[PDB]
Amino acid sequence: QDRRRLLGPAAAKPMAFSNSEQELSLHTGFIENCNGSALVEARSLGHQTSLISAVYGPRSIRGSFTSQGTISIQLKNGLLEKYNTNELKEVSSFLMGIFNSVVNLSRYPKSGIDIFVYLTYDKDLTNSQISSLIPHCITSITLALADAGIELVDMAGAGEANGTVVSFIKNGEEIVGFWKDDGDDEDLLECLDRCKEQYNRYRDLMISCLMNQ
Amino acid sequence: SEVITITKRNGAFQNSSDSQIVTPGELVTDDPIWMRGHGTYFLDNMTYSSVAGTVSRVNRLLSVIPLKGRYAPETGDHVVGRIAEVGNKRWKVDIGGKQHAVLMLGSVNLPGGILRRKSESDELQMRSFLKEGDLLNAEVQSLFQDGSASLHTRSLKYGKLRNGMFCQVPSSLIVRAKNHTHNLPGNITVVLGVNGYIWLRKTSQMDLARDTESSWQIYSDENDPSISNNIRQAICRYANVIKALAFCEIGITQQRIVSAYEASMVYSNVGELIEKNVMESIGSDILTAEKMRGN
Amino acid sequence: MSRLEIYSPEGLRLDGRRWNELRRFESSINTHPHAADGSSYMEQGNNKIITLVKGPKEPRLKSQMDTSKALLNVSVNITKFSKFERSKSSHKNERRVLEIQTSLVRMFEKNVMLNIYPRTVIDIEIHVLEQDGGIMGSLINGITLALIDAGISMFDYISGISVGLYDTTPLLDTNSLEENAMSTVTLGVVGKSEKLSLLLVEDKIPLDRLENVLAIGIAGAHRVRDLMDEELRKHAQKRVSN
Amino acid sequence: GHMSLSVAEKSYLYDSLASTPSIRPDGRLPHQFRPIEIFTDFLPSSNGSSRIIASDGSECIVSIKSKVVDHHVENELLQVDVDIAGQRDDALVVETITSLLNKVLKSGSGVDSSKLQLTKKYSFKIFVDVLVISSHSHPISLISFAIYSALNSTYLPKLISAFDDLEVEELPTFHDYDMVKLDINPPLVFILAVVGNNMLLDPAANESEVANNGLIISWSNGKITSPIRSVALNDSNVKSFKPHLLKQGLAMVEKYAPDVVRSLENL
Amino acid sequence: RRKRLADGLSVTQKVFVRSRNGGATKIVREHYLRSDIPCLSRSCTKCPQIVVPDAQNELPKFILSDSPLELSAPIGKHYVVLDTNVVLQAIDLLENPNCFFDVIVPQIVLDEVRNKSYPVYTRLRTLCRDSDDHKRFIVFHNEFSEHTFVERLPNETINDRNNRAIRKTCQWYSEHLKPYDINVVLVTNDRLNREAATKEVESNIITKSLVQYIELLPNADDIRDSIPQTFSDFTFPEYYSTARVMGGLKNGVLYQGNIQISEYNFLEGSVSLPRFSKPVLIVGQKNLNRAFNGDQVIVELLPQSEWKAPVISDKQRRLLAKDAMIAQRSKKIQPTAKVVYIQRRSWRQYVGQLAPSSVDPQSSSTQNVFVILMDKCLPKVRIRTRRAAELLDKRIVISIDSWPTTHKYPLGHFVRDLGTIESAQAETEALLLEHDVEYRPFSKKVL
Amino acid sequence: AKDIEISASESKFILEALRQNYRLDGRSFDQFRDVEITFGKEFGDVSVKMGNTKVHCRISCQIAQPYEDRPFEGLFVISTEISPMAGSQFENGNITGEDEVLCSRIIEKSVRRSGALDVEGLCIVAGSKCWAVRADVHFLDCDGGFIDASCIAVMAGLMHFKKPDITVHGEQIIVHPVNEREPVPLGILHIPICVTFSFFNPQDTEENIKGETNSEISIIDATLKEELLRDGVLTVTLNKNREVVQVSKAGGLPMDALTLMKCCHEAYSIIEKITDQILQLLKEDSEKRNKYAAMLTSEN
RNA sequence: CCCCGAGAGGGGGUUUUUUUUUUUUUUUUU
Ligand SMILES: [Br-]
Ligand SMILES: [Br-]
């Protein structure tokens, strides 16, 4: 099959089988390989998620010259739940826009800050699901950047409510990103309030993690 | 068409002293005395065309002028360009030709000018003068073997551009003249580069003195802190009418611009000048105006 | 074994043409002024091709720069909706396509005067919107027209044509049905000459029939050259008169 | 972004756009679109086609092809394929727009998938192939207009055999010549620019470069619908925005969209 | 739309849908409209001036006689233009040396015949190709001629357009041959063309049905027997639709194969199926369903209770199929089935003799009789004839037209009279053509 | 990549030599290099040598399942990956370069597409199990003519290769080893041979496009030095049945049609000698293996 | 060679894809 991997025999076919509000866990700086890293685990109802973020930078960019730094974000599929490459790219773009509003790029001329988020373990226990993972990604990237020592304007956090994801800064006064799939009609005000509550809780736990730990 | 003008069409991918026109491969002449110029090639007595254009005869120099092609920098042209890259002791600026033009560090005026003593740190701090993206006036000082242009800004007339907006038209619509910087009604000034690159800015004191501590700030990105809306709305209008003249293949001159600017006053909102029928009529009105004024 | 009348005893083909008739040939110059220095939209039969010539201009990488000549690049984009049956995979990296791109470059390197444009790059982008036989010949005509529109110097026209061989009957300008039912020969003729820039035979052809097939193609390609030249002078007069 | 501008040009443009009476560089109003040209039904090989040309030379070509599939195994009945010329198939911009567009035109979200059903077992799979020849800004709204035009001039084959595969189970056979026009309601995707406290419809290239933020708002059945995405039009001047701006944008689209659709609904 | 080219050539778009294997593909080909299509008539004095040579530098020959078969006014001298149906039904009469001498076959007809029946299409092409001084057939490419090409009107079925196309060809030929005093006769059984010509709305076109045309010939009595045509206690079941059997074969429900019917037993047949080891038996007359020996038939497995000892859903039918394979291995009970469709008939021109039992010597008008085929594995055929006394003791050639679900025996028509039984001429000739042996002299193209 | 520097002197000399009917190796313009074919111990092992040019081909096969589209046809692939062993001019694994893709496409259209190998006879059980024949070409030493060398290497290998005999019990495949029963040869429908022509313009481009009398030089089977200085290439493939398998003049120096036809007729005389040569070396190889088999049994 | 300076100084001459009308005796000359 592939000349770079061992994928086994081709006639083989994969095994198909027959028939509080949120619980968080935060850890930072456990990857010596990079500059900043974070572990974010969430458990709620019939879905738990364990994702790992890793920040590599600021490192060299050998092309032209830039007064500010350049951020790149890449999401990788984990072991269990898989997602479309397109969908992972879309979230990556959405995350790039968010942290280009938070990261003090002016302090890193001709430098690159490459942020990796590994969707290691995403279990679906219900015996576009990507929308519920987005706030946890932002939490991991924020923790990793702060752990790396990359300057941030403010602790960026987010929340999710009925397929709507919105990330806040400045005590929830302003918005650094808005995401909406499916959901209902004229439910904007309700989503903003519910997400700001999650944003506030996540921000408190993040600060608590960056300080005490 | 209250919000958007959408023109539609079905079943089609798209809408569908004599100057001698010649095509590539066509035989132009069989007189071996001729000196073959650009647009041509020869074999013994036969002279053929390499491009599609009109046969040109100047003295004993036979050449074929192409119908199309990029701007070709002549020595002494007044061009407007953008810094593409900065290296060693020179900049490479985008003019709009086949190649980037060069701008040596010794071909510009350093800040503080004649009083300034020579420093070997200037070559390492060129980005503090002209960096990537900056616009500027420049004169084609010399030409390289291939045809590339070497630029210079050794004048107060030339230098970094500010206090305005950029727009471009095909270089064929702008010809050489005695001067390419012009003052127009509305307190705005146009810079008509021969390369087709045009700069519209608020009229400065220099622009007035042209027909009638500062040397340290000749490379500042900062604009005039006091620019009225009336000048800004004038720039937008001058921009649209220039695009309108370009849309009709009309050669842009300082007279055609002011004429169009005053003629466009018929339309209340400036945004009305972006529509096709408005552009076509404005250009058509200029040609007919020159018709009955000329005869 | 074909149950359809590829060439009836009445000398008529499936589309109505006779053995020596070209398809509907309609050229179009300066179709994308704001996207390229030169552009052409080709309609040869049901074939629909957009051709864009970008250059000569500065190379994006100084590593790839020749100080004696211009760099000529050709990328053919055969869209997934070019045929009746939509192709699932892309053709961008297909070896068949890389050969086509390479072939086209090798053709115009000896026609386009790259020597007079040193330290520059000429990028040729092609989009095949619809395909119906003789796509190689149509690709050749599209590049030749677009290059001329860009005012890029070249020695002569290069006209492309395809000729099928149904047993003993030669068929000028083949469509998809005819190509599936017989071997075809693709020609790339320079100007009004007998010299071939491109000779392409991919299926079996008797050695005795090949010379006659070439003769038909060259004659047909000359007609393609005339149509290209005609439409070009027409556009020239409409522009030079303003 | 695409366009390269100096710091001075950006400052002038920003101040001009961030002004309380928002001044556009072309003199437009905060709700005025630039003139576009649309061609349809030029690809006979396909079931439907469109070609949109912008004023800045931006050009997009959409093709519509159909295929009979078993809707019991084929979940997605409408697949959007995006190809931006000059970009890799796995580019960030390409895949993002591809993912976005597929959500805009989902089977049970913004499209009446009932009109694609043939029998109790088989339905029509619609392949929407996008080809962006040229673009100088975020082409998401450009592509949306073309897809709309294409889907409103699409003709599919007509079924002959019975429509009950559970019992009699007849092989799907179609008429030799007659084709039924695809009656469907394609959604639209509008893109907005946020400069200071002002919101602009149809952001130009130079405008997007200095914008603080942007919005991607879908539109279907005379109302705002998902996907709704905030988007950084550039990456050097991205700032957070007040919630009222978000509500202003949704309101702005909600009143100017029917005007766009009306100019677009002409057969 | 329609584009005009430089050569005076035109071009339009022919678009159709091809259903294959449950698939739907939109096929589009370009359609060129010429202006140099020859009428191929000896009388014509305009066409040879506009005709062009083919690939081998050979101008086409004008073969249609300048003095065709003259018939009682107002027909006079005339050419015959055929419809699609009259070709499919009476191809035997179209090969008869004693009628149809100058015939014009429209392109649209030739195309429809090719799609509906390839072997008939080949026989029709042979008549065109082997044109001599006795029989002359041509193919007028009406779809390619700009003068005769018609396009589908809004809300018009394809069958009516094609009939209008044929009618336009007749109209064109009629006007084109006026100076030569040669009329055109449209032989069609379709009631649409006859009604459209009877009303005489646009142009005057002589329309006759097949039987009605034969009754205008000098030798009407000699060729009337070649015209294609309660008689039951029970009724055969209808054949399944093509769409049904196609889905059946694809879903492993129905199965096709060649059926064998022995002369020792006409009430039992057996089909050779690839999925089954031993041949599936077909017991009964309703189960055989008017099938002949050697026919490719499509069979459906009968319930296990209906099997021989020497269901609703498709799932149960595939289970029945498996139980059938098991039963064939056990050799105790053997599975039975019923034919529900005839893929390819083994029908051809058969040799036989009239049964003296079904012919009444007292009858003077037309009467139904039976013919005993020389193939002992084949049933007998019903024949409409008036010369029943003249064909009593002779070897005759007949061809089967159809076998209605009502009729107990298949229906056919008379073709040739080989001669008296037990004669060297008739017996040798019958012997040859029964074993498929071409004995006719080599054509001109061969020599 | 790594370039081969060619001086003006060398360019002018080799071209001027051609103008004087001289080529460095002493061959003639229409002279093909002597092809040497050596078979290894195993079947499918063949070594082709043309002067200094050295190529090696290895034919192998393994049980595999056919594609859904073609349930009656076996699998067949041809590999021609270049390596720095043939010269530092070649990048390791460069399978997208102009010359590489061309060569890859010439061989494919000459052997695969042409149906030189009977893929129908590679099927064991329809739609289930079949043979997957693989032709691996190894470019050892490059002195030009890699296409012609490969086409001979592939064909000689396929005709020399023998696959293990197979008896079928339903779907149970009994693969007999070479120890039990003898292996079975492959089915070859025809024997395609490539002949490559190199074109040189002794004058300038102007006299090539608009020149009256043609003067372009064409030589058969160019060496590396001649290959690096040519202006155009032509690869024509024929067989003993007097038919053109494929022709590929992908651009390059515009050439007269009658001259290209002359090349095709000249190539036909070469492919005839080469084909007969291959057959003879295969017979002698068979006679050699049989004579040793008799001397092994007699001593046993 | 080209650019620059009242005084032979300086700057440059560009880096795998439109392929499927199925049936009952050896051999030779006819
Ligand atoms: Br493996
Ligand atoms: Br230049």
Ligand SMILES: [Br-]
């Ligand atoms: Br609406």
Ligand SMILES: [Br-]
């Ligand atoms: Br025939």
Ligand SMILES: [Br-]
């Ligand atoms: Br079966």
Ligand SMILES: [Br-]
């Ligand atoms: Br197969």
Ligand SMILES: [Br-]
């Ligand atoms: Br050598």
Ligand SMILES: [Zn+2]
């Ligand atoms: Zn006539």
